[PDB]
Design a binder for this molecule. Structure first.
Ligand SMILES: Nc1ncnc2c1ncn2[C@@H]1O[C@H](COP(=O)(O)OP(=O)(O)OP(=O)(O)O)[C@@H](O)[C@H]1O
Ligand SMILES: [Mg+2]
Lengths: 259, 307
């Protein structure tokens, strides 16, 4: 069985990926020893990059996620190495490799439990970096990004800084611009993210998010009232983040309904 | 010694499919005056038969098989063919005459005429124009049904048809009914736009399309003030058969709207046709006379010679 899986891995590393993945998962030490080969391969590819290596990296990440899903100190090292190798390749900017990396990071983070002090700064900076250029992306990439944030938020408990959620519920943030897509899947995942964020446990970290939501609702209501020549009111929950913003009638109505 | 003559159970064919008069409704007419005539205009799949059946002698609780006017069947929608052909006729117990109309500019007619004077398109257009003129000269109220909004083609057709009438002039009333409405069509913001575009599209129509059958006066919008609209035209909406927010279909019940429309149509004015009092039999004779006269007319030939 040690060498039997080698042929399957080699064949899968070249729309039939689902069949081989399912067969390998249902078929079942060796994984620990094989992890070094893949880690060295990706490290060498990234070092030599500084472009036809993208498909190879994507295939390696896919097989890595498949073998990991087929299944307590090397998890942090592996996550840090993966994040560093993924962030190093900041030239080609391929969505396939990034999507595979996001899925792998999400499954690895979800494998453990929220009872440690793993490095969260790298994960937070990685998520923010991806969100900074996750506006004009594909449908298969946006869903992966949203899922990654969902896993990160649920995994880290009582360790979310105020600045993390402060920059996530502001007009400049792209999160508020992702719920306007025509598909319903994006709206569903967005609602799930909102629910996860609102389902925290620390009052100080949730107060800022609640205030931001209230401010957005107040701004939308004020815009709607002004659109029909009516004086503004309900300023008791006004937020400084929306001192001067213009929202369309349909946009304001949709925002209020979503909130 | 005062029993009624007879009660109509199903509609009859007033005009044959080959543009021929069918005098078979005399037995269902009396010597009474002050009669009401209703005409209907629309596209192929607007639903004229269903609305007429529901407004004459049917209710939504019934089935399409027992309707007075035969509607489209399941096997006919797939083929995309019309159902009602020619002109129908039916009189209710309240001495109200209902008249149906076949689709205008429908591709089914063209397809059936292909395997049968210059081009069939001109013939179809002339037939539609003639039926429109007939409906605009002997009908007290005409209802226009549109499956979708912003057609930009029916208004021009109506304007051209009103200018080719045979002949102290009289203009019949009009009603704008939007069949198969959605929630987006039940908003004041869109309602105002609809009213303004309708007013700007029929500035010189010379017809009575305002001042009667006000939607705001039907209690549909309890809190909408009448002054919010510059000019509330005679328009009505009909919804379909009876998502971050559950429920809230976005429109009132179909039965309530159809009942309100039926009552408003039944309580419509009945002005005189010509400078003489007309009765049921007299009205039928007048309709047949104008039909025969418009058939062998000169305006239609002159308009056809230009195409
Ligand atoms: N408001 C409505 N909502 C949903 N379906 C409707 C509505 N009104 C009509 N329909 C359906 O659309 C079709 C309308 O065809 P119908 O025979 O009733 O009249 P029509 O469109 O005037 O026909 P014709 O092609 O003879 O002009 C039917 O299948 C009817 O059930
Ligand atoms: Mg019909």
């Amino acid at each position: 069985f040690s060498t039997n899986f080698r042929d399957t891995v080699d064949i899968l590393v070249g729309s039939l990926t689902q069949q081989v993945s399912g067969w390998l998962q249902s078929l079942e030490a060796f994984s620990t020893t094989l992890l070094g080969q893949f880690l060295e391969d990706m490290e060498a590819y990234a070092e030599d990059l500084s472009s036809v290596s993208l498909p190879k990296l994507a295939a390696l990440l896919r097989v890595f996620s498949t073998v990991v899903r087929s299944i307590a100190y090397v998890t942090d090292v592996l996550y840090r190495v993966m994040r560093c190798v993924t962030a190093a390749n900041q030239v080609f900017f391929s969505e396939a490799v990034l999507t595979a990396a996001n899925e792998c990071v999400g499954v690895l983070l979800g494998s453990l439990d929220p009872s440690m002090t793993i490095h969260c700064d790298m994960v937070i900076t990685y998520g923010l970096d991806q969100l900074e250029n996750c506006q004009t992306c594909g449908t298969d990439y946006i869903i992966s990004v949203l899922n990654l944030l969902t896993l990160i938020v649920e995994q880290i408990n009582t360790k979310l800084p105020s600045s993390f959620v402060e920059k996530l519920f502001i007009p400049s943030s792209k999160l508020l611009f992702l719920r306007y897509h025509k598909e319903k899947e994006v709206v569903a995942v967005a609602h799930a993210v909102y629910q996860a964020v609102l389902s925290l446990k620390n009052i100080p970290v949730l107060e800022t998010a609640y205030k931001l939501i209230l401010g957005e609702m107040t701004c939308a209501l004020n815009n709607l009232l002004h659109s029909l020549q009516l004086p503004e009111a309900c300023s008791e929950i006004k937020h400084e983040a929306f001192k001067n913003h213009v929202f369309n009638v349909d946009n304001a109505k949709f925002v209020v309904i979503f909130d | 010694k005062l029993l009624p003559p007879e009660r109509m159970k199903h509609s009859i064919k007033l005009v044959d499919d080959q543009m021929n008069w069918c005098d078979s409704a005399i037995e269902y007419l009396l010597d009474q005056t002050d009669v009401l005539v209703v005409g209907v205009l629309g596209l192929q799949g607007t639903g004229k038969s269903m609305v007429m059946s529901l407004l004459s002698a049917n209710t939504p609780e019934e089935d399409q098989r027992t309707y007075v006017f035969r509607a489209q069947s399941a096997e006919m929608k797939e083929r995309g063919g019309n159902q009602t052909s020619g002109i129908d006729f039916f009189i209710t117990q309240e001495r109200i005459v209902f008249l149906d109309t076949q689709p205008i500019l429908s591709p089914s007619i063209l397809d059936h005429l292909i395997n049968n004077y210059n081009l069939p398109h001109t013939y179809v257009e002339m037939q539609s124009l003639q039926i429109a003129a007939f409906l605009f000269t002997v009908c007290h109220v005409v209802i226009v049904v549109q499956d979708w909004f912003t057609d930009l083609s029916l208004y021009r057709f109506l304007q051209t048809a009103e200018m080719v009438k045979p002949s102290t002039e009289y203009y019949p009333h009009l009603v704008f009914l939007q069949n198969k409405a959605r929630r987006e069509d039940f908003c004041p913001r869109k309602l105002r736009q609809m009213h303004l575009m309708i007013d700007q599209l029929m500035a010189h129509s010379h017809l009575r399309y305002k001042g009667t059958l006000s939607m705001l006066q039907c209690n549909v919008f309890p809190g909408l003030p009448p002054d919010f609209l510059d000019s509330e035209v005679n328009l009505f909406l009909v919804p379909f058969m009876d998502s971050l927010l559950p429920g809230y279909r976005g429109h009132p019940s179909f039965q309530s709207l159809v009942s309100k429309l039926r009552s408003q149509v039944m309580s419509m004015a009945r002005p005189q046709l010509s400078h003489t009092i007309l009765t049921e039999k007299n009205w039928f004779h007048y309709a047949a006379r104008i039909w025969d006269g418009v058939r062998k007319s000169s305006a239609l030939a002159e308009y056809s010679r230009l195409l």
